[PDB]
Design a protein around this ligand. Structure first.
Ligand SMILES: Nc1ncnc2c1ncn2[C@@H]1O[C@H](COP(=O)(O)O)[C@@H](O)[C@H]1O
Length: 504
Protein backbone atom coordinates (compact mmCIF):
# COMPACT_ATOMS: atom_id res chain seq x y z
CA UNK A 1 0.00 0.00 0.00
CA UNK A 2 2.01 3.01 -1.36
CA UNK A 3 0.78 6.64 -0.91
CA UNK A 4 0.19 8.57 -4.22
CA UNK A 5 -0.10 11.86 -2.23
CA UNK A 6 1.86 13.58 0.64
CA UNK A 7 -1.51 14.26 2.43
CA UNK A 8 -2.25 10.49 1.96
CA UNK A 9 1.17 9.46 3.42
CA UNK A 10 0.66 11.78 6.48
CA UNK A 11 -2.94 10.41 6.93
CA UNK A 12 -1.43 6.86 6.69
CA UNK A 13 1.00 7.95 9.52
CA UNK A 14 -1.91 9.34 11.65
CA UNK A 15 -3.66 5.90 11.28
CA UNK A 16 -0.52 3.73 11.93
CA UNK A 17 1.17 5.77 14.77
CA UNK A 18 -1.72 7.86 16.24
CA UNK A 19 -0.20 7.89 19.81
CA UNK A 20 3.45 8.62 18.75
CA UNK A 21 4.80 12.22 19.18
CA UNK A 22 4.45 14.10 15.83
CA UNK A 23 5.39 17.79 16.47
CA UNK A 24 6.39 19.68 19.69
CA UNK A 25 6.87 23.34 20.74
CA UNK A 26 10.15 22.98 22.75
CA UNK A 27 9.35 23.05 26.53
CA UNK A 28 5.64 24.04 26.04
CA UNK A 29 3.52 21.18 24.51
CA UNK A 30 3.53 17.97 22.35
CA UNK A 31 1.06 16.95 19.56
CA UNK A 32 0.59 13.26 18.51
CA UNK A 33 0.32 12.35 14.75
CA UNK A 34 -3.50 11.75 15.18
CA UNK A 35 -4.03 15.07 17.11
CA UNK A 36 -2.02 17.11 14.51
CA UNK A 37 -4.19 15.37 11.80
CA UNK A 38 -7.45 16.36 13.67
CA UNK A 39 -6.10 20.00 13.88
CA UNK A 40 -5.10 19.89 10.13
CA UNK A 41 -8.63 18.55 9.26
CA UNK A 42 -10.34 21.27 11.44
CA UNK A 43 -8.18 24.04 9.80
CA UNK A 44 -8.99 22.49 6.35
CA UNK A 45 -12.76 22.80 7.17
CA UNK A 46 -12.13 26.53 8.05
CA UNK A 47 -10.24 27.11 4.70
CA UNK A 48 -13.29 25.65 2.80
CA UNK A 49 -15.59 27.98 4.89
CA UNK A 50 -13.25 30.93 3.91
CA UNK A 51 -13.96 30.13 0.18
CA UNK A 52 -10.57 28.47 -0.69
CA UNK A 53 -11.36 26.19 -3.73
CA UNK A 54 -8.98 23.66 -5.41
CA UNK A 55 -5.89 25.25 -7.15
CA UNK A 56 -6.27 28.52 -5.08
CA UNK A 57 -2.88 29.80 -3.74
CA UNK A 58 -2.82 30.64 0.03
CA UNK A 59 0.27 32.74 0.99
CA UNK A 60 1.81 31.89 4.45
CA UNK A 61 4.33 34.24 6.20
CA UNK A 62 5.18 32.74 9.66
CA UNK A 63 8.25 31.95 11.78
CA UNK A 64 8.94 28.19 12.38
CA UNK A 65 5.78 27.67 14.58
CA UNK A 66 3.17 24.83 14.91
CA UNK A 67 0.51 27.27 13.51
CA UNK A 68 2.50 27.33 10.18
CA UNK A 69 2.83 23.46 10.13
CA UNK A 70 -1.00 23.04 10.60
CA UNK A 71 -2.00 25.71 7.97
CA UNK A 72 0.55 24.40 5.38
CA UNK A 73 -0.84 20.79 5.64
CA UNK A 74 -4.46 22.17 5.78
CA UNK A 75 -3.97 24.26 2.56
CA UNK A 76 -2.56 21.08 0.82
CA UNK A 77 -5.40 18.97 2.42
CA UNK A 78 -8.16 21.02 0.60
CA UNK A 79 -6.30 20.66 -2.80
CA UNK A 80 -5.05 24.31 -2.54
CA UNK A 81 -1.41 25.48 -3.07
CA UNK A 82 0.75 26.71 -0.12
CA UNK A 83 2.92 29.77 -1.07
CA UNK A 84 5.23 30.24 1.97
CA UNK A 85 7.15 33.61 1.97
CA UNK A 86 10.13 34.93 4.07
CA UNK A 87 8.59 37.21 6.80
CA UNK A 88 11.76 39.43 6.43
CA UNK A 89 10.64 40.54 2.87
CA UNK A 90 9.95 44.26 2.10
CA UNK A 91 6.46 45.53 1.03
CA UNK A 92 7.90 45.77 -2.56
CA UNK A 93 9.03 42.07 -2.53
CA UNK A 94 5.78 40.84 -0.82
CA UNK A 95 3.73 42.75 -3.49
CA UNK A 96 5.46 40.85 -6.37
CA UNK A 97 5.43 37.36 -4.69
CA UNK A 98 1.72 37.62 -3.59
CA UNK A 99 0.82 39.03 -7.09
CA UNK A 100 2.86 36.62 -9.32
CA UNK A 101 1.69 33.55 -7.24
CA UNK A 102 -2.01 34.65 -7.70
CA UNK A 103 -2.42 34.40 -3.86
CA UNK A 104 -6.17 34.66 -2.94
CA UNK A 105 -5.50 34.67 0.88
CA UNK A 106 -2.60 35.82 3.18
CA UNK A 107 -2.19 34.29 6.70
CA UNK A 108 0.18 35.71 9.41
CA UNK A 109 0.62 35.15 13.18
CA UNK A 110 -1.66 37.16 15.59
CA UNK A 111 1.02 39.96 15.86
CA UNK A 112 0.83 40.23 12.01
CA UNK A 113 3.37 41.20 9.27
CA UNK A 114 2.95 44.92 8.32
CA UNK A 115 5.02 44.84 5.05
CA UNK A 116 3.05 41.72 3.88
CA UNK A 117 -0.28 43.29 5.08
CA UNK A 118 0.60 46.55 3.18
CA UNK A 119 1.18 44.43 -0.01
CA UNK A 120 -2.07 42.36 0.35
CA UNK A 121 -4.12 45.56 1.15
CA UNK A 122 -2.83 47.22 -2.12
CA UNK A 123 -3.46 44.00 -4.20
CA UNK A 124 -6.96 43.64 -2.55
CA UNK A 125 -5.90 40.13 -1.28
CA UNK A 126 -7.94 38.91 1.76
CA UNK A 127 -6.01 38.88 5.11
CA UNK A 128 -6.29 36.41 8.03
CA UNK A 129 -4.26 35.39 11.16
CA UNK A 130 -3.77 31.96 12.87
CA UNK A 131 -3.14 31.33 16.63
CA UNK A 132 -2.90 27.92 18.44
CA UNK A 133 -4.09 28.09 22.11
CA UNK A 134 -3.21 24.88 24.07
CA UNK A 135 -4.20 25.52 27.76
CA UNK A 136 -5.84 23.27 30.46
CA UNK A 137 -9.24 24.83 29.42
CA UNK A 138 -9.02 24.37 25.57
CA UNK A 139 -6.88 23.34 22.55
CA UNK A 140 -7.94 25.32 19.41
CA UNK A 141 -6.38 26.74 16.17
CA UNK A 142 -8.31 30.06 15.71
CA UNK A 143 -8.21 31.33 12.06
CA UNK A 144 -9.34 35.03 12.21
CA UNK A 145 -10.25 36.47 8.72
CA UNK A 146 -10.43 40.35 8.52
CA UNK A 147 -12.85 39.82 5.53
CA UNK A 148 -14.78 36.61 6.47
CA UNK A 149 -16.52 34.85 3.49
CA UNK A 150 -19.02 32.76 5.60
CA UNK A 151 -20.86 33.16 8.98
CA UNK A 152 -16.93 19.26 4.15
CA UNK A 153 -13.37 17.78 3.59
CA UNK A 154 -14.81 14.27 2.77
CA UNK A 155 -15.73 14.93 -0.94
CA UNK A 156 -12.17 16.41 -1.42
CA UNK A 157 -9.83 13.58 -2.65
CA UNK A 158 -6.22 14.87 -3.18
CA UNK A 159 -4.78 13.94 -6.65
CA UNK A 160 -1.04 13.34 -7.37
CA UNK A 161 -1.09 16.07 -10.13
CA UNK A 162 -2.44 18.74 -7.66
CA UNK A 163 0.07 21.64 -7.18
CA UNK A 164 0.63 21.69 -3.34
CA UNK A 165 3.74 23.95 -2.82
CA UNK A 166 4.58 27.09 -4.92
CA UNK A 167 8.01 28.81 -4.46
CA UNK A 168 9.96 31.41 -6.54
CA UNK A 169 13.57 30.83 -7.78
CA UNK A 170 16.03 33.03 -9.81
CA UNK A 171 17.11 32.74 -13.50
CA UNK A 172 18.52 35.15 -16.14
CA UNK A 173 15.46 37.53 -16.40
CA UNK A 174 15.29 39.71 -13.17
CA UNK A 175 11.70 38.32 -12.68
CA UNK A 176 11.83 35.29 -10.31
CA UNK A 177 10.50 32.03 -11.89
CA UNK A 178 7.46 30.32 -10.25
CA UNK A 179 8.13 26.64 -9.24
CA UNK A 180 4.96 24.49 -8.86
CA UNK A 181 5.67 21.28 -6.80
CA UNK A 182 2.86 18.64 -7.07
CA UNK A 183 1.38 16.39 -4.33
CA UNK A 184 3.22 13.61 -6.32
CA UNK A 185 6.54 15.62 -6.30
CA UNK A 186 6.66 16.03 -2.46
CA UNK A 187 5.68 12.37 -1.59
CA UNK A 188 8.37 11.22 -4.14
CA UNK A 189 11.00 13.45 -2.39
CA UNK A 190 9.90 12.29 1.15
CA UNK A 191 10.38 8.60 0.08
CA UNK A 192 13.88 9.47 -1.35
CA UNK A 193 14.89 11.25 1.94
CA UNK A 194 13.27 8.47 4.10
CA UNK A 195 15.14 5.82 1.99
CA UNK A 196 18.74 7.26 1.92
CA UNK A 197 18.69 8.17 5.70
CA UNK A 198 16.41 5.17 6.64
CA UNK A 199 14.12 7.49 8.73
CA UNK A 200 11.73 5.53 11.06
CA UNK A 201 9.00 6.42 13.67
CA UNK A 202 11.75 6.17 16.41
CA UNK A 203 13.68 9.18 14.90
CA UNK A 204 13.24 12.79 16.19
CA UNK A 205 14.93 16.12 15.16
CA UNK A 206 15.06 19.87 16.07
CA UNK A 207 14.25 22.31 13.16
CA UNK A 208 17.04 25.00 12.92
CA UNK A 209 16.22 26.09 9.28
CA UNK A 210 13.40 28.26 7.83
CA UNK A 211 10.26 26.17 6.93
CA UNK A 212 9.63 28.51 3.88
CA UNK A 213 12.69 26.91 2.12
CA UNK A 214 12.58 23.27 0.79
CA UNK A 215 15.57 22.16 3.02
CA UNK A 216 13.71 22.78 6.34
CA UNK A 217 10.18 22.17 4.92
CA UNK A 218 10.67 18.88 2.96
CA UNK A 219 13.80 17.24 4.56
CA UNK A 220 13.20 18.70 8.09
CA UNK A 221 9.38 18.65 8.65
CA UNK A 222 7.54 16.60 5.95
CA UNK A 223 10.15 13.77 5.53
CA UNK A 224 10.04 13.29 9.37
CA UNK A 225 6.17 13.32 9.61
CA UNK A 226 5.89 11.05 6.49
CA UNK A 227 8.32 8.60 8.23
CA UNK A 228 6.24 8.84 11.48
CA UNK A 229 9.28 10.50 13.19
CA UNK A 230 9.00 13.48 15.64
CA UNK A 231 9.70 17.21 14.85
CA UNK A 232 10.70 19.75 17.60
CA UNK A 233 10.30 23.54 16.94
CA UNK A 234 12.49 25.81 19.14
CA UNK A 235 10.41 28.26 21.31
CA UNK A 236 12.15 31.23 19.53
CA UNK A 237 10.47 30.22 16.18
CA UNK A 238 14.02 30.08 14.68
CA UNK A 239 17.47 28.46 15.29
CA UNK A 240 18.73 29.26 18.86
CA UNK A 241 22.40 28.38 19.71
CA UNK A 242 21.72 28.50 23.52
CA UNK A 243 18.70 26.05 23.49
CA UNK A 244 19.75 23.78 20.52
CA UNK A 245 21.38 20.89 22.50
CA UNK A 246 18.99 21.28 25.53
CA UNK A 247 16.11 20.71 23.00
CA UNK A 248 17.96 17.86 21.11
CA UNK A 249 18.63 15.97 24.44
CA UNK A 250 15.19 16.59 26.14
CA UNK A 251 13.38 15.34 22.93
CA UNK A 252 15.85 12.41 22.31
CA UNK A 253 16.93 13.70 18.83
CA UNK A 254 18.67 11.07 16.58
CA UNK A 255 19.71 13.57 13.80
CA UNK A 256 19.60 17.23 12.63
CA UNK A 257 20.08 19.04 9.25
CA UNK A 258 21.53 22.60 8.90
CA UNK A 259 23.78 24.68 6.54
CA UNK A 260 27.55 25.25 7.13
CA UNK A 261 27.00 28.77 8.70
CA UNK A 262 24.60 27.19 11.31
CA UNK A 263 27.08 24.26 11.86
CA UNK A 264 29.87 26.92 12.37
CA UNK A 265 27.82 28.65 15.17
CA UNK A 266 27.08 25.21 16.83
CA UNK A 267 30.87 24.35 16.62
CA UNK A 268 32.01 27.69 18.21
CA UNK A 269 29.19 27.11 20.80
CA UNK A 270 30.88 23.69 21.62
CA UNK A 271 34.31 25.38 22.22
CA UNK A 272 33.16 28.19 24.62
CA UNK A 273 30.16 26.33 26.24
CA UNK A 274 30.81 22.53 26.06
CA UNK A 275 27.89 20.21 27.06
CA UNK A 276 28.81 17.58 29.72
CA UNK A 277 27.84 14.87 27.13
CA UNK A 278 26.25 14.91 23.60
CA UNK A 279 23.40 12.60 22.45
CA UNK A 280 24.77 9.95 19.98
CA UNK A 281 22.93 10.90 16.70
CA UNK A 282 22.61 8.42 13.74
CA UNK A 283 23.96 11.22 11.43
CA UNK A 284 24.39 15.04 11.10
CA UNK A 285 23.30 16.57 7.73
CA UNK A 286 24.71 19.56 5.70
CA UNK A 287 23.11 21.02 2.49
CA UNK A 288 22.36 24.24 0.46
CA UNK A 289 26.02 25.53 0.49
CA UNK A 290 29.41 23.68 0.17
CA UNK A 291 30.64 22.38 3.60
CA UNK A 292 34.42 22.96 4.14
CA UNK A 293 36.19 19.61 4.89
CA UNK A 294 37.70 21.27 8.07
CA UNK A 295 34.10 21.98 9.37
CA UNK A 296 32.99 18.36 8.51
CA UNK A 297 36.11 17.10 10.41
CA UNK A 298 35.45 19.35 13.48
CA UNK A 299 31.67 18.47 13.60
CA UNK A 300 32.47 14.68 13.56
CA UNK A 301 35.35 14.99 16.13
CA UNK A 302 33.22 17.30 18.41
CA UNK A 303 29.81 15.46 18.41
CA UNK A 304 30.87 11.89 17.35
CA UNK A 305 28.12 11.66 14.64
CA UNK A 306 28.82 11.04 10.90
CA UNK A 307 28.35 14.31 8.88
CA UNK A 308 26.60 13.59 5.50
CA UNK A 309 26.72 16.46 2.90
CA UNK A 310 23.76 16.50 0.40
CA UNK A 311 22.78 18.49 -2.76
CA UNK A 312 19.19 19.83 -3.12
CA UNK A 313 17.18 22.52 -5.02
CA UNK A 314 13.54 23.79 -5.13
CA UNK A 315 12.80 22.51 -8.71
CA UNK A 316 13.89 18.98 -7.51
CA UNK A 317 11.53 19.25 -4.44
CA UNK A 318 14.81 19.39 -2.38
CA UNK A 319 16.95 16.19 -2.44
CA UNK A 320 18.92 15.29 -5.64
CA UNK A 321 22.05 13.54 -4.18
CA UNK A 322 23.45 12.72 -0.68
CA UNK A 323 26.42 10.91 0.91
CA UNK A 324 24.89 7.62 2.22
CA UNK A 325 24.73 6.22 5.81
CA UNK A 326 28.13 4.74 6.86
CA UNK A 327 26.43 1.26 6.99
CA UNK A 328 25.52 1.63 3.22
CA UNK A 329 28.75 3.30 1.90
CA UNK A 330 31.49 5.93 2.52
CA UNK A 331 30.92 9.74 2.71
CA UNK A 332 33.60 11.92 0.97
CA UNK A 333 34.46 15.50 2.12
CA UNK A 334 33.93 18.05 -0.72
CA UNK A 335 31.36 15.66 -2.35
CA UNK A 336 27.49 15.68 -2.24
CA UNK A 337 27.29 11.85 -2.67
CA UNK A 338 25.19 9.74 -5.13
CA UNK A 339 21.74 10.36 -6.71
CA UNK A 340 18.66 9.19 -4.66
CA UNK A 341 15.54 7.82 -6.49
CA UNK A 342 16.27 9.88 -9.67
CA UNK A 343 18.57 9.84 -12.77
CA UNK A 344 21.53 12.33 -12.76
CA UNK A 345 23.85 13.02 -15.78
CA UNK A 346 26.74 15.45 -16.56
CA UNK A 347 25.83 17.11 -19.95
CA UNK A 348 27.92 19.41 -22.24
CA UNK A 349 26.24 22.38 -24.08
CA UNK A 350 25.21 19.91 -26.91
CA UNK A 351 23.64 17.38 -24.43
CA UNK A 352 26.46 14.75 -24.64
CA UNK A 353 26.70 12.63 -21.40
CA UNK A 354 30.32 13.37 -20.27
CA UNK A 355 32.53 10.57 -18.78
CA UNK A 356 33.63 10.53 -15.06
CA UNK A 357 36.08 13.31 -13.99
CA UNK A 358 34.88 15.78 -16.73
CA UNK A 359 33.13 19.05 -15.64
CA UNK A 360 29.66 19.64 -17.22
CA UNK A 361 26.15 20.83 -16.19
CA UNK A 362 24.57 18.58 -13.48
CA UNK A 363 21.15 17.61 -15.00
CA UNK A 364 18.45 15.47 -13.25
CA UNK A 365 15.31 13.45 -14.18
CA UNK A 366 12.92 11.89 -11.58
CA UNK A 367 9.40 11.92 -10.03
CA UNK A 368 10.55 14.70 -7.57
CA UNK A 369 11.23 17.24 -10.44
CA UNK A 370 8.66 20.06 -11.16
CA UNK A 371 6.54 19.60 -14.38
CA UNK A 372 7.99 23.06 -15.30
CA UNK A 373 8.08 26.81 -14.38
CA UNK A 374 4.57 28.41 -14.14
CA UNK A 375 3.45 30.16 -17.42
CA UNK A 376 7.11 30.46 -18.65
CA UNK A 377 7.78 28.40 -21.86
CA UNK A 378 11.00 30.49 -22.45
CA UNK A 379 12.52 29.33 -19.09
CA UNK A 380 11.24 25.70 -19.54
CA UNK A 381 12.76 25.48 -23.10
CA UNK A 382 16.35 26.06 -21.75
CA UNK A 383 15.75 24.28 -18.37
CA UNK A 384 14.47 20.98 -19.98
CA UNK A 385 16.87 20.79 -23.01
CA UNK A 386 17.47 17.16 -24.25
CA UNK A 387 14.70 15.88 -21.87
CA UNK A 388 16.75 16.54 -18.65
CA UNK A 389 16.29 19.36 -16.04
CA UNK A 390 19.39 21.68 -16.08
CA UNK A 391 20.35 22.62 -12.44
CA UNK A 392 22.63 25.55 -13.48
CA UNK A 393 25.46 23.89 -11.41
CA UNK A 394 28.85 22.70 -12.88
CA UNK A 395 30.11 19.37 -11.40
CA UNK A 396 31.61 15.91 -12.13
CA UNK A 397 31.37 12.23 -10.99
CA UNK A 398 34.40 10.32 -9.53
CA UNK A 399 35.01 6.53 -10.18
CA UNK A 400 32.42 5.64 -7.43
CA UNK A 401 29.72 7.94 -8.98
CA UNK A 402 29.98 10.62 -6.19
CA UNK A 403 29.05 14.18 -7.42
CA UNK A 404 31.49 17.13 -6.85
CA UNK A 405 30.09 20.72 -7.34
CA UNK A 406 32.95 22.88 -8.81
CA UNK A 407 31.07 25.96 -10.23
CA UNK A 408 27.79 27.50 -11.55
CA UNK A 409 26.44 28.35 -15.08
CA UNK A 410 23.51 30.34 -13.52
CA UNK A 411 24.24 33.75 -11.83
CA UNK A 412 23.77 33.22 -8.02
CA UNK A 413 25.43 34.59 -4.83
CA UNK A 414 25.02 31.80 -2.19
CA UNK A 415 25.18 33.81 1.12
CA UNK A 416 25.28 31.08 3.85
CA UNK A 417 22.60 29.03 1.98
CA UNK A 418 20.36 32.03 1.02
CA UNK A 419 20.19 32.75 -2.77
CA UNK A 420 20.74 36.35 -4.08
CA UNK A 421 20.12 37.03 -7.84
CA UNK A 422 22.70 39.64 -9.04
CA UNK A 423 20.24 40.26 -11.97
CA UNK A 424 17.27 41.05 -9.58
CA UNK A 425 19.53 43.39 -7.46
CA UNK A 426 20.90 45.00 -10.71
CA UNK A 427 17.24 45.79 -11.69
CA UNK A 428 16.73 47.54 -8.26
CA UNK A 429 20.03 49.57 -8.49
CA UNK A 430 19.46 50.57 -12.20
CA UNK A 431 15.86 51.66 -11.26
CA UNK A 432 17.39 54.41 -8.99
CA UNK A 433 17.09 57.75 -10.90
CA UNK A 434 20.73 58.86 -10.04
CA UNK A 435 22.24 55.44 -11.11
CA UNK A 436 23.24 55.12 -14.84
CA UNK A 437 24.97 51.65 -14.74
CA UNK A 438 25.20 49.07 -11.86
CA UNK A 439 26.76 45.55 -11.41
CA UNK A 440 26.01 43.52 -8.22
CA UNK A 441 28.81 40.87 -7.84
CA UNK A 442 29.83 38.03 -5.46
CA UNK A 443 33.06 37.82 -3.35
CA UNK A 444 34.42 35.13 -0.96
CA UNK A 445 33.37 35.64 2.74
CA UNK A 446 34.87 33.57 5.66
CA UNK A 447 31.42 33.22 7.40
CA UNK A 448 28.72 33.18 4.60
CA UNK A 449 30.97 31.54 1.90
CA UNK A 450 29.96 34.25 -0.65
CA UNK A 451 28.82 37.90 -0.05
CA UNK A 452 27.14 40.52 -2.37
CA UNK A 453 28.82 43.88 -3.14
CA UNK A 454 27.96 46.21 -6.11
CA UNK A 455 29.75 48.78 -8.35
CA UNK A 456 27.80 51.85 -9.68
CA UNK A 457 28.44 54.55 -12.36
CA UNK A 458 26.14 57.45 -11.31
CA UNK A 459 24.24 59.83 -13.71
CA UNK A 460 26.89 62.46 -14.77
CA UNK A 461 26.42 65.59 -12.54
CA UNK A 462 24.75 63.75 -9.56
CA UNK A 463 26.54 63.49 -6.12
CA UNK A 464 25.16 60.08 -4.90
CA UNK A 465 26.90 58.28 -1.94
CA UNK A 466 26.90 54.62 -0.66
CA UNK A 467 24.44 55.58 2.19
CA UNK A 468 21.78 56.73 -0.38
CA UNK A 469 22.21 53.51 -2.51
CA UNK A 470 22.02 51.27 0.66
CA UNK A 471 18.93 53.05 2.19
CA UNK A 472 17.09 52.74 -1.20
CA UNK A 473 18.02 49.00 -1.62
CA UNK A 474 16.74 48.27 1.97
CA UNK A 475 13.24 49.63 0.99
CA UNK A 476 13.18 47.31 -2.12
CA UNK A 477 15.28 44.20 -1.03
CA UNK A 478 15.55 41.89 2.05
CA UNK A 479 18.61 42.78 4.24
CA UNK A 480 20.53 39.57 3.19
CA UNK A 481 20.14 40.53 -0.56
CA UNK A 482 21.30 44.19 -0.02
CA UNK A 483 24.92 44.82 -1.16
CA UNK A 484 27.20 45.37 1.93
CA UNK A 485 29.64 47.70 0.02
CA UNK A 486 29.01 50.14 -2.93
CA UNK A 487 32.14 50.92 -5.10
CA UNK A 488 31.23 54.16 -7.02
CA UNK A 489 33.53 54.23 -10.14
CA UNK A 490 34.02 56.14 -13.48
CA UNK A 491 33.93 53.14 -15.94
CA UNK A 492 32.83 49.43 -16.08
CA UNK A 493 34.26 46.94 -18.65
CA UNK A 494 30.60 39.81 -13.22
CA UNK A 495 33.98 38.03 -12.58
CA UNK A 496 36.12 41.02 -13.82
CA UNK A 497 34.60 43.59 -11.35
CA UNK A 498 34.94 41.06 -8.44
CA UNK A 499 38.59 40.48 -9.58
CA UNK A 500 39.10 44.33 -9.38
CA UNK A 501 37.47 45.57 -6.10
CA UNK A 502 38.22 42.38 -3.98
CA UNK A 503 40.49 43.02 -0.89
CA UNK A 504 43.66 41.09 0.25
N1 LIG B 1 26.07 21.07 -0.84
C1 LIG B 1 26.04 22.13 -1.64
N2 LIG B 1 27.19 22.77 -1.93
C2 LIG B 1 27.15 23.84 -2.74
N3 LIG B 1 26.10 24.40 -3.34
C3 LIG B 1 24.97 23.73 -3.04
C4 LIG B 1 24.85 22.62 -2.22
N4 LIG B 1 23.53 22.21 -2.14
C5 LIG B 1 22.88 23.06 -2.89
N5 LIG B 1 23.69 24.01 -3.47
C6 LIG B 1 23.29 25.11 -4.34
O1 LIG B 1 21.96 25.47 -4.04
C7 LIG B 1 21.18 25.48 -5.26
C8 LIG B 1 19.73 25.23 -4.95
O2 LIG B 1 19.13 26.42 -4.37
P1 LIG B 1 17.70 26.28 -3.65
O3 LIG B 1 16.73 25.94 -4.76
O4 LIG B 1 17.42 27.63 -3.00
O5 LIG B 1 17.86 25.16 -2.63
C9 LIG B 1 21.88 24.44 -6.13
O6 LIG B 1 21.57 24.61 -7.51
C10 LIG B 1 23.34 24.76 -5.83
O7 LIG B 1 23.79 25.86 -6.58
Amino acid sequence: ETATTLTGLLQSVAKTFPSRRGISLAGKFDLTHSHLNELVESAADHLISAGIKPNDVVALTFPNTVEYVILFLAVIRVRATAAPLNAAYTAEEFEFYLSDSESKLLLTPLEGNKPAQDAASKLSIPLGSASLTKSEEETKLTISLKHPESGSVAKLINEPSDVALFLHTSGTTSRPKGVPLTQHNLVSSVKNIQSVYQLTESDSTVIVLPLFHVHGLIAGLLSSLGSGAAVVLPAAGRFSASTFWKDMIQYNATWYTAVPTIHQIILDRHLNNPEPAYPKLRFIRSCSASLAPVILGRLEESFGAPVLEAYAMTEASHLMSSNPLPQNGPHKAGSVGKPVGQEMAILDESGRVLEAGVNGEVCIRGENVTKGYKNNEAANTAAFLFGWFHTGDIGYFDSDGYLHLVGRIKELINRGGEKISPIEVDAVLLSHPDVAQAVAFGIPDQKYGEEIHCAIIPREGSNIDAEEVLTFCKKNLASFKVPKKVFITDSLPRRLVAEHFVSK
